[PDB]
Design an enzyme around this catalytic site. Structure first.
Site, PDB file in Angstrom:
ATOM      1  N   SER A   1       0.880  -1.092  -0.025  1.00 13.03           N
ATOM      2  CA  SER A   1       0.008   0.153   0.156  1.00 13.03           C
ATOM      3  C   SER A   1       0.812   1.150  -0.059  1.00 13.03           C
ATOM      4  O   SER A   1       1.978   1.078   0.107  1.00 13.03           O
ATOM      5  CB  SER A   1      -0.964  -0.005   1.261  1.00 13.03           C
ATOM      6  OG  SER A   1      -1.630   1.169   1.337  1.00 13.03           O
TER       7      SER A   1
ATOM      8  N   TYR B   1      -2.814  -1.154  10.310  1.00 18.32           N
ATOM      9  CA  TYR B   1      -2.788  -1.710   8.773  1.00 18.32           C
ATOM     10  C   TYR B   1      -1.665  -0.794   8.154  1.00 18.32           C
ATOM     11  O   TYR B   1      -1.058  -1.460   7.239  1.00 18.32           O
ATOM     12  CB  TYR B   1      -4.140  -0.929   8.306  1.00 18.32           C
ATOM     13  CG  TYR B   1      -4.264  -1.142   6.677  1.00 18.32           C
ATOM     14  CD1 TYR B   1      -4.118  -2.294   6.235  1.00 18.32           C
ATOM     15  CD2 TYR B   1      -4.359   0.076   5.716  1.00 18.32           C
ATOM     16  CE1 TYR B   1      -4.529  -2.351   4.479  1.00 18.32           C
ATOM     17  CE2 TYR B   1      -4.046  -0.103   4.478  1.00 18.32           C
ATOM     18  CZ  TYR B   1      -4.359  -1.333   3.992  1.00 18.32           C
ATOM     19  OH  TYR B   1      -4.531  -1.541   2.556  1.00 18.32           O
TER      20      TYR B   1
ATOM     21  N   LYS C   1       1.351  -3.380   6.178  1.00 17.98           N
ATOM     22  CA  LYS C   1       2.113  -3.177   4.948  1.00 17.98           C
ATOM     23  C   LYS C   1       3.557  -2.766   5.179  1.00 17.98           C
ATOM     24  O   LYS C   1       4.680  -3.227   4.385  1.00 17.98           O
ATOM     25  CB  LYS C   1       1.276  -1.842   4.386  1.00 17.98           C
ATOM     26  CG  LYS C   1      -0.192  -2.271   4.334  1.00 17.98           C
ATOM     27  CD  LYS C   1      -0.482  -3.461   3.364  1.00 17.98           C
ATOM     28  CE  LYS C   1      -1.726  -3.412   2.808  1.00 17.98           C
ATOM     29  NZ  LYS C   1      -2.143  -4.740   2.423  1.00 17.98           N
TER      30      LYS C   1
HETATM   31  N1  LIG Z   1      -9.502  -1.132  -0.823  1.00 16.61           N
HETATM   32  C1  LIG Z   1      -8.775   0.000  -1.452  1.00 16.61           C
HETATM   33  O1  LIG Z   1      -9.300   1.108  -1.388  1.00 16.61           O
HETATM   34  C2  LIG Z   1      -7.220  -0.151  -1.072  1.00 16.61           C
HETATM   35  C3  LIG Z   1      -6.334   0.855  -1.103  1.00 16.61           C
HETATM   36  C4  LIG Z   1      -4.894   0.544  -1.164  1.00 16.61           C
HETATM   37  C5  LIG Z   1      -4.442  -0.642  -0.833  1.00 16.61           C
HETATM   38  N2  LIG Z   1      -5.434  -1.768  -0.935  1.00 16.61           N
HETATM   39  C6  LIG Z   1      -4.896  -3.367  -0.846  1.00 16.61           C
HETATM   40  O2  LIG Z   1      -5.113  -4.027  -1.974  1.00 16.61           O
HETATM   41  C7  LIG Z   1      -5.478  -5.485  -1.629  1.00 16.61           C
HETATM   42  C8  LIG Z   1      -6.863  -5.710  -1.626  1.00 16.61           C
HETATM   43  O3  LIG Z   1      -7.572  -4.648  -1.235  1.00 16.61           O
HETATM   44  P1  LIG Z   1      -9.112  -4.506  -1.789  1.00 16.61           P
HETATM   45  O4  LIG Z   1      -9.376  -3.071  -2.123  1.00 16.61           O
HETATM   46  O5  LIG Z   1      -9.335  -5.217  -3.009  1.00 16.61           O
HETATM   47  O6  LIG Z   1     -10.081  -4.917  -1.021  1.00 16.61           O
HETATM   48  P2  LIG Z   1     -11.789  -5.581  -0.612  1.00 16.61           P
HETATM   49  O7  LIG Z   1     -12.668  -5.001  -1.633  1.00 16.61           O
HETATM   50  O8  LIG Z   1     -12.096  -5.777   0.696  1.00 16.61           O
HETATM   51  O9  LIG Z   1     -11.343  -7.137  -1.365  1.00 16.61           O
HETATM   52  C9  LIG Z   1     -10.187  -7.978  -0.816  1.00 16.61           C
HETATM   53  C10 LIG Z   1     -10.498  -9.451  -0.786  1.00 16.61           C
HETATM   54  O10 LIG Z   1      -9.659 -10.138   0.114  1.00 16.61           O
HETATM   55  C11 LIG Z   1     -10.522 -11.306   0.677  1.00 16.61           C
HETATM   56  N3  LIG Z   1      -9.884 -11.611   1.921  1.00 16.61           N
HETATM   57  C12 LIG Z   1      -9.784 -10.705   2.854  1.00 16.61           C
HETATM   58  N4  LIG Z   1      -9.429 -11.421   4.248  1.00 16.61           N
HETATM   59  C13 LIG Z   1      -9.369 -12.726   3.754  1.00 16.61           C
HETATM   60  C14 LIG Z   1      -9.109 -13.928   4.461  1.00 16.61           C
HETATM   61  N5  LIG Z   1      -8.674 -13.876   5.631  1.00 16.61           N
HETATM   62  N6  LIG Z   1      -9.135 -15.073   3.813  1.00 16.61           N
HETATM   63  C15 LIG Z   1      -9.561 -15.178   2.432  1.00 16.61           C
HETATM   64  N7  LIG Z   1      -9.774 -14.007   2.000  1.00 16.61           N
HETATM   65  C16 LIG Z   1      -9.804 -12.835   2.197  1.00 16.61           C
HETATM   66  C17 LIG Z   1     -11.853 -10.573   0.782  1.00 16.61           C
HETATM   67  O11 LIG Z   1     -12.913 -11.668   0.688  1.00 16.61           O
HETATM   68  P3  LIG Z   1     -14.050 -11.564   1.530  1.00 16.61           P
HETATM   69  O12 LIG Z   1     -14.102 -10.036   2.149  1.00 16.61           O
HETATM   70  O13 LIG Z   1     -15.189 -11.887   0.753  1.00 16.61           O
HETATM   71  O14 LIG Z   1     -13.951 -12.510   2.600  1.00 16.61           O
HETATM   72  C18 LIG Z   1     -11.944  -9.704  -0.631  1.00 16.61           C
HETATM   73  O15 LIG Z   1     -12.350 -10.382  -1.689  1.00 16.61           O
HETATM   74  C19 LIG Z   1      -4.822  -5.487  -0.225  1.00 16.61           C
HETATM   75  O16 LIG Z   1      -3.647  -5.830   0.204  1.00 16.61           O
HETATM   76  C20 LIG Z   1      -5.245  -3.972   0.442  1.00 16.61           C
HETATM   77  O17 LIG Z   1      -4.499  -4.038   1.538  1.00 16.61           O
HETATM   78  C21 LIG Z   1      -6.703  -1.605  -1.005  1.00 16.61           C
END
Ligand SMILES: NC(=O)c1ccc[n+]([C@@H]2O[C@H](COP(=O)([O-])OP(=O)(O)OC[C@H]3O[C@@H](n4cnc5c(N)ncnc54)[C@H](OP(=O)(O)O)[C@@H]3O)[C@@H](O)[C@H]2O)c1
Ligand SMILES: NC(=O)c1ccc[n+]([C@@H]2O[C@H](COP(=O)([O-])OP(=O)(O)OC[C@H]3O[C@@H](n4cnc5c(N)ncnc54)[C@H](OP(=O)(O)O)[C@@H]3O)[C@@H](O)[C@H]2O)c1
Ligand SMILES: NC(=O)c1ccc[n+]([C@@H]2O[C@H](COP(=O)([O-])OP(=O)(O)OC[C@H]3O[C@@H](n4cnc5c(N)ncnc54)[C@H](OP(=O)(O)O)[C@@H]3O)[C@@H](O)[C@H]2O)c1
Ligand SMILES: NC(=O)c1ccc[n+]([C@@H]2O[C@H](COP(=O)([O-])OP(=O)(O)OC[C@H]3O[C@@H](n4cnc5c(N)ncnc54)[C@H](OP(=O)(O)O)[C@@H]3O)[C@@H](O)[C@H]2O)c1
Lengths: 244, 244, 244, 244
Positions: free
Chosen positions: D136, D149, D153
């Site tokens: 991140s 968080y 990271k």
């Molecule tokens: N969201 C943002 O704005 C954002 C910004 C910067 C960086 N990131 C990073 O990008 C990556 C993904 O984020 P995202 O935006 O894609 O988030 P998201 O919309 O919450 O999706 C993340 C996915 O990871 C799965 N997941 C979480 N915990 C899990 C677990 N314990 N076991 C198996 N699957 C799991 C979730 O499945 P379920 O929820 O269905 O269980 C979900 O499908 C991460 O490393 C996050 O830190 C995200």
């Protein structure tokens, strides 16, 4: 992956050899319009024959005056690769006024001039754009006898970020790529001695030096809109050296 | 904490005023022998009245020739604070050849010239020592209209680490300090405009700009042997700015 | 340099030995009232004898619940050195879920737990304070068989910065120290192997491992208001390691 | 640019939604054999209908035992995208043991558990490989209520390097990507507030939030042989948030 550099005008400094040369070839095949800027007319002669259609330009990029009008009206370009750079190696207690002056004049000043030209057009056309500055691994880790060199390189990386920040709302991007040793005229100069380059290779987890290919791939990438959210960066191409 | 700078020969470039002056004063009370190097004889004169026993020296540190000779026999000095610097602020598309040229000549080349002198003696006498370069917060973070300054500042950091590594086995240490805005004449140029300083101040966790003492306290610390294991670093004095 | 720690209440974790005990000792001697927190009972009992007046607090800081009531009622503390930590070295493919767990609850979580008690104390009291986190050199450079350790440290660095940001407007600073090897309990374990040392000593421009005094110096400096404008930092005490 | 991922075994964690999903969809389209792994069964059911051929695994990657018996039979995977993560947003003073516990067993511990297995498998076949860690931009910069968080990271970035260093000689590359807020439900949590999103757009030079193609563009680029000199890296995708 489609990089989408086809039909784009692309300026490449230091086009005469090494990474620049390869970068121009590689850019040609892609179907970009290429402007090769270099110091030895002899080199640009061979180039144009290799890659027809590419407008050659002879000039000393270390010369503000000869550069400002040797490219002042090189027309509409869309992507720029600041790669012309000279490396003058002196131990710190020996660094001289001349070495210092030539190095920053080419290593960074030119970068500013061309980038000023190229970007000025892009803005005028009201069009997005992108620039790649060929920095280095020593731009964040010092090496013996490179106090001036690493200063240009470290200088380059910060310039990259100011350009990014000012040109940002102009939808133009600015990134640098920082490779380890490349076995070019430059590379085949210092790191010639086995023990010499050996001690360096011991620091690289992939246990090998970069090739023109590698650094050219991150340049092409950084020019492409595939990296439309990456700007002001220092993409390492050093086999992990900075990591440990 | 006992810094133990007393009775030590200490050169401070840009001693005429701001952090330079203050750094001179504070260095005096410590009981160290001080060489204050500045451009305006007027600045040095007054100082001497305050700090008697401070050998003043006038010269353009931007002049290699004027510098190499006005310092050829400055005797044996043991501590160095490279602090003289100019700020030429131009938007990126308006940067000039001379603006680039003066900035690098003072903010970087000078540093190598003086440091070269001081170090030779240190090495010559077979003695340990230490050097401090006043870099800046923008040496790693870009700000508008600071394309060249940040690049000097960025340069300075890499120059510091090469200096550190080469002079390392000579028991000399090299470190930089990277303050946020300081309300000196320099600070009192850009950050005069409220709105300007608001957006910058909005970034600082401590919600205030630095004071000359702060930067002076980090300089003394870095000169003292209290930090005898720190070298090639960038001690920030930007109130948290780099953290977020 | 009067730091002005005398008369302030400083909690020091991992006080039993090494950096923590040299750090207690330095503070006692400076007139600070200290709460020394460690794991080994007999460790705390000699310190108290070595420094009459320190309040000893025996507990396993890797135990949230023990920590909470063994410290929850410690009182108005003004400073804080998070120094306790464990080093469980495993090759990446031999990392264990236990090693991960233990390493992160001690090396990091406890840092959040104690920092909460204190910080909350200062904040309610509407009084400034300061916190020092003892991270490491390997928090920014990978070292073999240190996959978890460096990661805690790596997390250590960032937590400082978030703490910094958040506690900033409550006039509380947060910084980390990042020393190279220290031939303490921890140090004289894995690097007793003369060939394992050299390998590291060669990458150090100062060609020596650190000493407890060196990071205690760095700690006291940062705990002190000498550094009232340094927050969010990571102070190297690796004698140039990060530099090359 | 010929990534050449076609026909190779690619494992994706968090393939259920957001970047994990998009990365499977794009990894699939290129003719790759993707093993999709996520926590909510209903997600893989749909994705699987979106990308016929994929091989999903429903599991809570926060679970060492479940994972270790869910993924011990995962087939000779050749590439790896550790994307699974959880954002448990708490002010530093309000942080809880529980939230710290989960955050670090999913965001980090898992990364370590999946990554051993693949590597292990990769090494036994005496075959090169690639890993991409989705980190991140708050991994290097602090944001309020992100102490844990941003910590995971931050630790993630260092894990990447130790991994890159120990795995390096096995022809296995490891790299992290560092995107700014993506408008996923996750980002659409603490970044949906118009005012909260605005003060972020203000720091991003390019002046836009990111969309999931961009990070997926960088992942696929780092998995590809096009970047086989890049390892232990943190490729930012935050439209220049870090540069200024
Ligand atoms: N969201 C943002 O704005 C954002 C910004 C910067 C960086 N990131 C990073 O990008 C990556 C993904 O984020 P995202 O935006 O894609 O988030 P998201 O919309 O919450 O999706 C993340 C996915 O990871 C799965 N997941 C979480 N915990 C899990 C677990 N314990 N076991 C198996 N699957 C799991 C979730 O499945 P379920 O929820 O269905 O269980 C979900 O499908 C991460 O490393 C996050 O830190 C995200
Ligand atoms: N080579 C490596 O080991 C290595 C490693 C890390 C980083 N880099 C960097 O990669 C970039 C290129 O390196 P390289 O290996 O391609 O070097 P190279 O083989 O020497 O090529 C450099 C090219 O730039 C041209 N050039 C230099 N100064 C110029 C000037 N003032 N005006 C016009 N043209 C000029 C040279 O022309 P002439 O031959 O006519 O002078 C030459 O064609 C540089 O920024 C260098 O710092 C190289
Ligand atoms: N001002 C700030 O807020 C700030 C912030 C971060 C970092 N810094 C840095 O900290 C150092 C000191 O800055 P400051 O705020 O104290 O600045 P200042 O008030 O302008 O004083 C700098 C001093 O250096 C001298 N100087 C400048 N160029 C010189 C040259 N070419 N030759 C000889 N002397 C020269 C000036 O003397 P004359 O007036 O006689 O030329 C002046 O006495 C610098 O390296 C500056 O870059 C300053
Ligand atoms: N020494 C090195 O080379 C080195 C280098 C760079 C950074 N550091 C860092 O410096 C700090 C301490 O290192 P050191 O060399 O001083 O170590 P040390 O000699 O092993 O002592 C550390 C102290 O922390 C205590 N401690 C450990 N776990 C604890 C727990 N769970 N609860 C309460 N007390 C605990 C130990 O007590 P018991 O033994 O009784 O448990 C010991 O007194 C750490 O953050 C380490 O990461 C060390």
């Amino acid at each position: 992956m489609e990089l989408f550099l086809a039909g784009r005008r692309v300026l490449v400094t230091g086009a005469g050899k090494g990474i620049g040369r390869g970068t121009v070839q590689a850019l040609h095949a892609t179907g970009a319009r290429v402007v090769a800027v270099s110091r030895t007319q002899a080199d640009l002669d061979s180039l144009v024959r290799e890659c027809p259609g590419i407008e050659p330009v002879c000039v000393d990029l270390g010369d503000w005056e000869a550069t400002e009008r040797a490219l002042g009206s090189v027309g509409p370009v869309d992507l720029l690769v600041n790669n012309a750079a000279v490396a003058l190696l002196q131990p710190f207690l020996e660094v001289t006024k001349e070495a210092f002056d030539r190095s920053f004049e080419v290593n960074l000043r030119a970068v500013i001039q061309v980038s000023q030209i190229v970007a000025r057009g892009l803005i005028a056309r009201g069009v997005p754009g992108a620039i790649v500055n060929v920095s280095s691994q020593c731009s964040q880790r010092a090496v013996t006898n490179h106090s001036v060199y690493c200063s240009t390189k470290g200088a380059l990386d910060m310039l990259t970020k100011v350009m990014a920040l000012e040109l940002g709302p102009h939808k133009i991007r600015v990134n640098a790529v920082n490779p380890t040793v490349v076995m070019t005229s430059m590379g085949q100069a210092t790191w010639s001695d086995p023990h010499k380059a050996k001690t360096m290779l011991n620091r690289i987890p992939l246990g090998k030096f970069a090739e023109v290919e590698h650094v050219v791939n991150a340049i092409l990438f950084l020019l492409s809109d595939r990296s439309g959210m990456t700007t002001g960066s220092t993409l390492p191409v050093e086999g992990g050296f900075w990591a440990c």
